[PDB]
Structures are given as C-alpha cells and as structure tokens.
Amino acid sequence: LYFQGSLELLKLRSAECIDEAAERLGALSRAIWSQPELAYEEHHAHRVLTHFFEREPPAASWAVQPHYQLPTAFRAEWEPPEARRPLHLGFLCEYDALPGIGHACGHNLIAEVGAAAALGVRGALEGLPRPPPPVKVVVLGTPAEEDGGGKIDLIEAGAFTNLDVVFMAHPSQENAAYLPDMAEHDVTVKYYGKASHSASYPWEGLNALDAAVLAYNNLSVFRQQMKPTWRVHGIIKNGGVKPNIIPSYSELIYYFRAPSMKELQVLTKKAEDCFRAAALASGCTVEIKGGAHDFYNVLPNKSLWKAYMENGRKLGIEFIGSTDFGNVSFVVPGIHPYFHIGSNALNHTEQYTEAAGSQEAQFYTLRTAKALAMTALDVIFKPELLEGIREDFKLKLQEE
Amino acid sequence: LYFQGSLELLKLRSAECIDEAAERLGALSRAIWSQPELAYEEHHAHRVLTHFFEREPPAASWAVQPHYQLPTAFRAEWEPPEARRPLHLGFLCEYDALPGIGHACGHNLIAEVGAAAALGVRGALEGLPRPPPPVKVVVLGTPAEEDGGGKIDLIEAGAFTNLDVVFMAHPSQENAAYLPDMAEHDVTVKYYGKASHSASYPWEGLNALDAAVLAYNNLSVFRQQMKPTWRVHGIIKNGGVKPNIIPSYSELIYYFRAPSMKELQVLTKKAEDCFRAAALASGCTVEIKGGAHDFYNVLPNKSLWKAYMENGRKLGIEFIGSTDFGNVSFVVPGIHPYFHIGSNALNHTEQYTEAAGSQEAQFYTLRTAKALAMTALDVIFKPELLEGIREDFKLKLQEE
C-alpha cells in the first residue's frame, strides 16, 4: 500500500522504470524489426542487443557476454552491488524472423519485452533503501527459435542449469498466461530405388516416387486413427526429375506434433511404420533422419501462472504451435504468456509483420513487460511462492 | 495314298467313324450343355459320359471306371484285342460350366471333342486287317477346370504318369494349334486389426479396412513396374460392416498371372511385399493364403504342333488365360489347340453359351476332333515323330 518500501511500491517503480525507457526500448524493437534476420544469422540483432545492455547506465553495469556459445547469442547479468544462494531470474530475448515475410511472429517484440522486464526489475531493486535480497537478473539472447532451437543449444551448454525461474512473453491474438504448446519431432525421409528406362525396361526398376506416394497414402489413412490433438504435415521435396527415367530417389520432409513426449514417441513410431511400409511395398530402401532437436511441450507452472495473472489484471490486461521454450520449461520453472498487440492478424502472416512493427504494438508490449517484471518481484519477495513454484515444477515433471 | 492299309486311309477311316457318330456325339454335347454344372458338382455330366462309353458297341468294349478318384471324374480305356510297351494316348474331356451364364466357355464341346477323337482312333485301328500296333486309348474326364483344377487332383493321384501323349481341344474365336496360356497363383488376404468405437476412441483401433485400401494402392502403383505379360486382378470381398465401428477385419481375393513359373514366383513375392506393407503401415496382422493349386503355363510341343497343323490344313482349318492343362503339359507331351465354332462371341459371355449349344458349332467341333484323331494316328505310326515329340518335351522342360 502506502507503506515505505512495500511490494506494491516496488511494482510501481518497475512500471515507471519501463515507462522511462519506452523510447530506447522502442528503438530496440525497430532496429530488429526493420532488419529481419533468419535463424543463426541474427548478427545485426545480436549487435543491437549487446550494445543495448552495454550502454545501460552506468556503463558496464550490465555484465555482457557477446557470442555466448552461439555466434548470435548473448548473455547479460546484473545484481545489486551489495554482498551481505542468490536467486537467479532469467529473461529470454528472441529475435529471428521468418523467410520472405520478415518478423511475422513479432519476435522483435519478444526481444523488447524480455529486455524491458529485466530493466524494470533492476530499476525497482535499485530504489530499495535497505540492501536488497541477493538476486541475479540474467538476460539470455536465444537465437533461432523458428528453426533449429537455439534455446536447446544453450541448454546443451548448460546455460539454464543455474536459473531458478525464467520469463519471456510472445505476441499473438489474445492475452493468456499460458497456452498449450505441443512437442515436435521433425524428419526427412529419403527413398532409394533402382533407375530404369521406363520406355524400355521399366520392370527392371524400383520406383522411389511410388515409395513417396505410398508413404503419403499410409499416413493419410492413418489420420483417422490419430488422436485429435495430434498433427502431421509434410511435403514431397523430391518426386523425380524426368518422366523417361523411373525415379531412383525421392525425398519427403515431415513434422509431427503431440501434446506430450510420450504421445509424440507413439506418433513417431506409427509414422515410421508408414515410411518403412512404403519401402517394403516399393522395394526401395529408406533413410529416416530425425531433426537435430526434438522440441518439448511447455510445462505449465500453476503458482507462477496465478501470480502473473494477478499482476496483469491490475495492469488492465483481460485474459481468456511449438517452441524450444518447451525444453527450457522442462529444466527451469518458467512462464510463456501470450499477449495481444492491437491487431486481428494471425502470427506468421504478412499482416502480422505490420502489427509487430506498429506504434500500436508498443503499448501492449510494454504493458506485458510490466506484468513480467512485477511477477519477478513476486518471486523475489515471496519465499512461499518460490516454494509453490518449485513444488508445482516437481509434481509436473513426474507427470511428464 | 491309294495303298491298301496306308496312313492316309487310316486317317480317312477315323474321319468317317466320327461322321457316323455325329448324332450321338451331338446328343452327348446337348446333354451336358442343357444341364450346366459347376466345378466338382458335375454329377449329371459324369453320368452322361460314363454311360456314353459303356454303351459304345460292343457293350463293355470300353473299360469304364466311374468316380475315378474324384466323384465326377472318370476313366475309359480301349485297346486292340491283339496281344502279339504299348503306346498310351490320352484324350481329356472337360464339362464344368460357369456360374449364372452356363457353358459360356464351350466345355460341353470339349467333352464332345475328346470323346469323338477317341472314337475316331479306335474305329481307325479296328479297320486294320493285320494286327495293329500295341496302343491304349485312354479317355480321362477331368472335372473342375474353371475352379480348383481337377487335372491337378488327377495328377496328384498319378493318373498321367503312364501317358505318352495327351490330346484335347478348346473352342474359342480362332483356330490355333497352340496359344500362350499363363501360369496362375490365387491368394486370399485377410487383415486383422483392433475394433474401436470411431465416435468415441477411434485412435484405440487398428483399421483393417485401411490395410485393404493400402494394399490396393501398393499393388496399383506396382503395375507400372510389372512386366507387360503380367496380370494382377483382385477385389475387396470384405471392407467393413458398420461405419460406427473401426473395421477389425478385411478380406481381399487376388490372382496373379505370368508366362512362366519363375516369373510367377517373382510377381507373387512382389505382391506379398505389397500385402505385408499394408499390415505394417496399418498395424494389422496379415494372413496370406495361397490357392490349393498353382496352375502351370502350357508347355508347347513343336513336333506335335506341326503334325496337328498339317492334319488340320488337310481338313480345311485355317490357322492364325490359364488352365490346369498346363500342369498336365509339364508331365505329359500334349497339345491344347483352340478352334473357332462359327461365332464372334467371346468366351465367358452369355452369347458364347448360345454358340456352344448351337447346331453350327457341331461342324467345327467334329472337324477339330478329326484333326486330333488324325494326329494321334501320326504318333502311332511314326516312331520318328514320337522321338521328336519326346526330344522337344525334354528340351522344353529344361528351359522351364
């Protein structure tokens, strides 16, 4: 309330700190939005974001590690200069675009919203007269969300093993503190047959294009027995070269989605039967190559969920795919809220690139960053909440 | 020529003996044609044919064994009453019809043409003043040509192991001393899945109807890589019962045809891959049940071929599927000529049943029986021809 040093006043300070930084946070968004870069190629965005934290006053108050494991990844850390285990709070920035249509998923706003929340938390804790509790604010630039999974590469380097809670936000069509993101497995299927002159001796050949079509048929009829939450999508990248030669090679690219890892394994095995059946029927051999990284479904955290919604409702927010944050949510208690930005456009469309760079989206982006920062303050000053967060994280890991 | 006892006069006598028997041979044809019976159910035809040979004068001059191994099969034998290894000459009678459309393959004429040729040979040898060479005229009633393969059942009982040459003729659209009949393998494919209520939990079921459709697709694309002489035809006998229940059972009936046994084995294995692939893709188990008897392609005999054509050309005959005679032709040197009967209709059509029972067909039937009988006389009185027949039979068995 009106008590000197209360949590409410701390939350107000973080909101005011975000407002004071609205101009340079908007410029940060525009710099990434105006120069769209693809997965692992976000060299400009990496330069803009490291420069941002390096320039925050006082200079070098943020400890910035550019090229953190990946060339376009970075890490920035701040903690109160006091010295009396410190709580580690992570905030993630995404910044890879989509081919042809630019930042059609609003990832420029994700970078902004993660940087704004971190600025808000530090600014709130700097205003604390008495020494603030030991806490480290960690910002992780995670490239290549749309392809590859940079968070997973960072997990593989141990970048998340010391975080207690992780925050980030994603723009979409509605405001929700959690949405069901599915597990994903990607696969490329290559069939190898035996070429033959179809005009002369076509019976001496093994038709790899037949294999591709029969695989497509195997999966298609399988859709009737798929769980309604399952998803299967694929294309025929290579279906032959010339009609006068029986195709001896074909290539399919597929991905499978299911709400749990156990269900994804079942769906993947069923699909493998479909691909291998097409080889048996056509006489070809088959190479089934899975993606470098399976993407996990996002583990919800009930305690973190309720705390964020309470903060958002105070801010005026009215509440109601797959991502590599799912892998993070399995190793660190996190929340991945989606927020509306003033547009009816759908993510991954040209019109969303327009909304993502719009002036209108700035208000909604900074508002959700305020909710994130205020929720981080909750975890810091409510040890009971941190316990419930960890208890919910433990029980959810058992259910898998 | 005009020499007392020459082969030409013997051939004339067989033709005159067939003419004298034209009335009762026609009645024999009509008795089978007017009472069509299916495979293994030819009880009337068996009664008519055994009575025919029993009644040939002098009574019991033909040694008749009714119910010879099969209930509707029979064997009739005659030899000159002299006594001085005897040459064994076989003539086959078929008499099973087709369901619904009667004797649409003219099998009533096959019975007639085999009985007429045997009568002609005996009548010719009875006119020989000097004792005739030792020869046994064997008539074999072979039921169930259109389904089952009664010749194969008779082969299994050793009925053909003592024959030196075998004769029969088949009515069709053109006159040919030999036509390419293919090897055949029949199969019934049953898929077993797991039933489930498609309205509630269809993902808990394994769709046996999917298996049937995927098998159909596997074979269909395979047709492009089939040898142009190969044939594949099949139906879906059972494709489900009710739409509200995921089908847990499906049944397909197929047959495969190829010009050689080696090619039939390759085609059958390729098809087995197609059927088993559908099980793998759908998760069902599969039971592939082959027919009781594989049907062999008909082995040609060049020496017997040329001799029959020379006889037919003298008679006015102008020369240009699968059958269990193919299995016979593998174990006994035989010929299976096709002959025109005065109609443009195709075998296995309703209009062929009309031609088969027509008065017009009698002339052509008795004419081809004359050619058969005259060719049997060639083998009897030309040991050089019997040698060439056996030499051609040996060399053809090596080529398989």
Add this chain to the structure above:
Amino acid sequence: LYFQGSLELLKLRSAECIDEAAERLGALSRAIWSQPELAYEEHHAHRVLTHFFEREPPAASWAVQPHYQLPTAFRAEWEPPEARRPLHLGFLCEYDALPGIGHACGHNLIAEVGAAAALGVRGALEGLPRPPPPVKVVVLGTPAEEDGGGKIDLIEAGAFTNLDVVFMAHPSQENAAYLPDMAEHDVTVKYYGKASHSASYPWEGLNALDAAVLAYNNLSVFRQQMKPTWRVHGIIKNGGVKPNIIPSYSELIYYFRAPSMKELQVLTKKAEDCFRAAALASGCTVEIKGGAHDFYNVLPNKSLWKAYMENGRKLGIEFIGSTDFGNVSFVVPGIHPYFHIGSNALNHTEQYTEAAGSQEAQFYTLRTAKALAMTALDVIFKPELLEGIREDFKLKLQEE
C-alpha cells in the same frame, strides 16, 4: 426453507415420491434391459412403458396414448385436476438397444429416468394444498435413437410444437449438465461401372472398385484440411464379388459429424466432391444417397443449465457423439445432462451393458431423475427463469 408450501419442500416431496417408486422404477428398468430391442422394433419396451403409466394410481390418471404415431412410440399426460396457457413440460424416454451387445448405451436407464422425473413432478404438485399452477406433464416415448431418429419422426408429426421445456438424461462416464453433441449426416455411396472379363478384355471395363478406393483416398488426404472438430468414418460395404470380373458395382457407407449445421454442410459438400471425383477418375457414375434424417447438434440453454446444476449440487452430484435430441433442442428449450452410474466402462461396449443393468446404477439413475424433477419445479414456480430460458433459446437460435 421451513415455510409451509415453499419450493424447497416441493423439491423434497418430488425426491421422496421418486424414492417411494424406486422398486417399480427398477423393475421398469430391468424389463427393458433384460429384453433388448433394436430401433423401431421395441414392441416389448413399448408394452412395458404404456402399462407402467396406465397402472400408476389412480388408474387412468395418466392419459396414455399407445402407438403414438410410431408403432413403438407412446405419449402419457397428467395435469392437476383443477381448472381455475398451461405450462407444458416434456420428459423423454428412450429404450432401443444396440445389435449384439444389448443395452450398451444404458437406454433402459433413460426410460427409467424420464419416467421417474415425471412421477416426481406429479407427486410434488399433488401435495400442493392450494390449487397448483396450470401445468401439463407430458411423457414421450421416443424409439429408435441409435438408428433412424424417432424424435425426428415425432417432430415431423408435430409432437413437440406445444412443449415449453423438455427434459431427459443419458448415462455415461461423468456428470455434466450439458455435453457437446455434434450434427450428423449419413450417406450411402454407390458406384456403377461396366463389367468386363479381366482375363480377356479388362480395358473394356469401368472399375467400380477403383472408384471406391479412389474415394477412400480422396477423403483420407482431405483429413489433413478438416477442422479438428470434424469427423468422417466409412466402410466399403461392397468391394467386388469375384476377381475374374472387373467390378461394375461398389458401395460405401459413410457418416459425417461437425459441431454446427453450417459446418456440416461444408463438410458434406467437400465429401461430395471426393465421391464425385472418384466417379470422374474411374469413369463410373455415382449415386450419393443421404440418410432419411440429418441429426442436429444439441442447442444449450444457459438458464436451464444453471438451474439443473444448482439442483444437482444439492443432491451430491459432482460435475466436471450425436443424438436426435439435437433436433428437439432446436424446436424446444431442453437439457440433456449426462450422469455417471458407478462404472468406468465406455458407452457402446459390452461392459456398459453390465453397468446399465446393475443394481449400482439404480442409485445414480434415481438421483439424476430427482435433479430433473426439481429443475422442472424451478421452471414452474419461477416465471423469471422461464423468461431467461426463452431468451436464451431465442438468442441461441439466431447464432444457429
């Protein structure tokens, strides 16, 4: 409360009236359960249910019309003998079983629960000292729910045009005052080709079995672009007779489900394109015959929903396909709650027939009948609720 003639005491009386009738209501359930009858063949169940209402004391106090439009349908009506528009309250009894597995949907309990609720309402209103408000209690026996749609035949005869509210309940695995039942369209697809002897001239034929398989393929790949709430299930009833004859006839039986009538029309047209495409590709002609009756989705009524849940919570009930009640819910404000009966078995399984006839199911059946009867009392004595029910019924009809 404890006020002479309050609504609470009226609701208690209906519950006590149902308890007093527990024995004969159980016998009613067992009589239908032990003698399972299929759609439109429920002659025994019709006899049991008409006798039940005819025998309720005083004799002929229920006005019973046997053979009401359908031979196995009936109508029973009671109203207070006072005379001062009367409110018309309908209760539906179902009683058709499923082939082979008996009453695997618990329809014997539906008949019981509808009769019990009607008895409870009458018994409550008979205890009213002052003349009770004008109300007619209508019981409608609706045969053939699992096939045909007897409610629709009754709608076609105008049987529902004078009802203000309609009640019924359905046993399942969980307690819910409303569940999403989908709209359904049934279709039989017949393809007509041209027969030909596949061994001779298969190119002279038009393969109706190809048409069936190609239709199956057309729909199968279409599943990827179906809305996740859509359902398509079908079988190949006729896929050919003999493999030696190119099939000139094939038959498929399908049904389509969608949450709204507008979506069902879109899905049905898409499927019609798939069926007609198979005719074009194969050269066959196609006859697409829709079912006699399309089944509507069930229209929810919010006011009736909340009132029933409040009654059920007081009774201890803890709350969390397609039916011809959907067509009723479009013309009369109704509720179709599902209730647990003490078993984990799924509807339309053999083990559900066991639960449906179990002694355990009686307690849950009579408890839900109490909730229905108490909700009918709400509508009678709360004109504001009847207004909200009609307002919710109007607004829902606009949304379609």
Add this chain to the structure above:
Amino acid sequence: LYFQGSLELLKLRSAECIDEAAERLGALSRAIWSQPELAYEEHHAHRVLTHFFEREPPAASWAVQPHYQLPTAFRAEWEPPEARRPLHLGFLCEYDALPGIGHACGHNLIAEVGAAAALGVRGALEGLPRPPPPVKVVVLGTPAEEDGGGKIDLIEAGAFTNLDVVFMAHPSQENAAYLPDMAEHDVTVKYYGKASHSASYPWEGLNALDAAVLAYNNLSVFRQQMKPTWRVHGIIKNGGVKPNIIPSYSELIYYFRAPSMKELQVLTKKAEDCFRAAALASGCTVEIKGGAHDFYNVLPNKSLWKAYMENGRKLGIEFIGSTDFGNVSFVVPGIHPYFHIGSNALNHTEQYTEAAGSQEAQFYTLRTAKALAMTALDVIFKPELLEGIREDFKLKLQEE
C-alpha cells in the same frame, strides 16, 4: 548380273562408293560422337555436317543450305547434271545426344548412315554411262529428335511435301526393317490451391500436394484397365516447399504412349479425367498443358519393307519407343530400320555411348547404309515398286 549397266552392278557401285568413303564417314561419326550436343543446341554437329557435304568433290556439287529453318538444321541436294517429274529421295541425319551420358542412342551413327546412303546413291548414278533417270537426292539434317521433334518443325515448314520416299536408319540391339514405334503425347500438370499455415489454420487451405498424390492414385489404379500396349509414366516435379505451409502449388510431368493416334486420344482423355478428378477432390484448379508436338506412330510400308530386307539379306544382315519420324512416315512413304552395331548394351545407357563411338560399330553402320542406298536404287529403277509403295502408303493412311 554380268550385264553392262544392270541394277546389280549399280548396287555394287554404291557399296564400293561407301567403302571408299569409310574413312571420312568415320571421322564424321567421331566428330559428332566426341562433342555431344542436346536438342536444338547441335551447333557443332550442324557445322560438321554442312562442311561435309560442301567438301564432297567436286566442291559445291552438293547444294547445301545451312540453318535450314532451324538454326542447327540443314538441307543438302544433288541431282545428275543431265536435263533430258524427278523422283525425290530423302535421307535423314539425326545428331542430338542425351543429357549427361552423351550419344547413348547412337545418333552420331544415324548422321553417318544417312550421309553414307546419300553418297552411295550419287556415286552409283554418276557411274551410269547413259543419262540417268531424273532423281533428286535430298539430305535433311533433323535436329532435336530426343526432345522437341525437329522433324515436326521441318514438316511445319513444308520440308517434306516434295519427297517421294524417305530413308534413315537407327542403331539398336537387333536388325529389323521395321519396329513398332508408338504415338506419344506429353503433358505438364499444374495444380493451384490455397496456402495456409498448417500449424494454425490448415483447414483454410487447399492442398495442391494432395491433388498431385490423388492424380497419381487415379492413374495408378487406371493401369489395370489400360490396354497392354499403352504406357503411362510421370513424375512429381514440384511437391511442396516447406512442411509448415500447406502447398498451394504442385507440378507433374507425364507422357502417354499408344500404338495409334486414335488410341492415344482415348488414353489422353482418360488421363485428363484423372487429373481433373484430383482437382475436384482437393478443391484446386488445374492447368493441363500438352507438349508442343504430338509424336505419331511410324507407318509401315510393306513394299519398301520387302525391298530393303532383300537388299540386306544379300549384304549378310540377319533379321529377326517413339520418334518424330512417325510424323514424317505419315506424310512421306518411309522406312526406319533398326540395326545391330556389335554390342549387347541397351539404347539410352552409358554403355551404348561406348558402342556408338566404337570402331566395331563402323562396319555395321556402313553395312546398313549400303542396304539403304541399294533400296533407293530399287525405287529409282523399278516404277512398279514405286507404285506398290504409294499404294501401300495410301491404304495405310486410310487405316490410320
């Protein structure tokens, strides 16, 4: 015989003239074989062949038109310098290779064999003491046989309207004066659908890849009802780009072959039904684009056939796809014999390129050129043969 100026001596002179030119004709073959060029890109081969006829002594005795209508086509003409309608005898040179594997159809030998036959005819007629009959020897370089059909472009320019007979020869595995070459129709099929994000709203898209697969299925099952002489081969050139986007475009390339133009039209319409059915089933639109030129089957000429075989048998030759020569054979009486070149390799394989350039192939190439030249001499000095050739050409055009 041994008569001064007989036809036999003229035929000997043509054979000796070909032998004397064996060295430079071999160099002609090697120049084309060592520098393989594709359809319409045979600039080197055009330069070599025009230089060849320009250099034949006396210089400019051959009237040579380079770049005759097509850039790589040419025309060369010689006639006896006497002057007294002249018979026009055409000889065709092909010289386009195949991509990657060079002259795997032996087209370098076709150019050689056409030039050698023309040289042989001129040399024979130059030795005639008395003025020779009026005859024009026309050589036509016809590029782009393997793709496009340069003969058809030349037909369209009227290049064949004044020829009375046309000769050429093609190397293969066996010697035959005529082989059944089929009519061909080529087609590219493009499907246009509606893109949609399969992860979000895949039901808002129309799957053009489905269309491609359904077309493949439509044609595949159609193979069972195809005439055994029909051929259908095609590939999926474009089957989608990324799996996350429902494909809105697909592309198939097919070709169809049948022995007659009437049968090709029937097969093409049946295939068009298959392609259009896939559009209807998937909701896409379809563009069916046929090739620039349909290739005709080769019309046989019996009189020319027998004359060439009689010449070849005297030379030691023992006798036993689709091409644009079929279109020529429809407008000019021609023969297109195939000849063995000393190898077991199949045309359009890497090992045939080895045989085509081999020293061994030269003997067989010059031998068949001798047969061609000797047959041209037959037509010149046998007006009865020219009549029978034209009579056979007329009667064959009626039968189509």
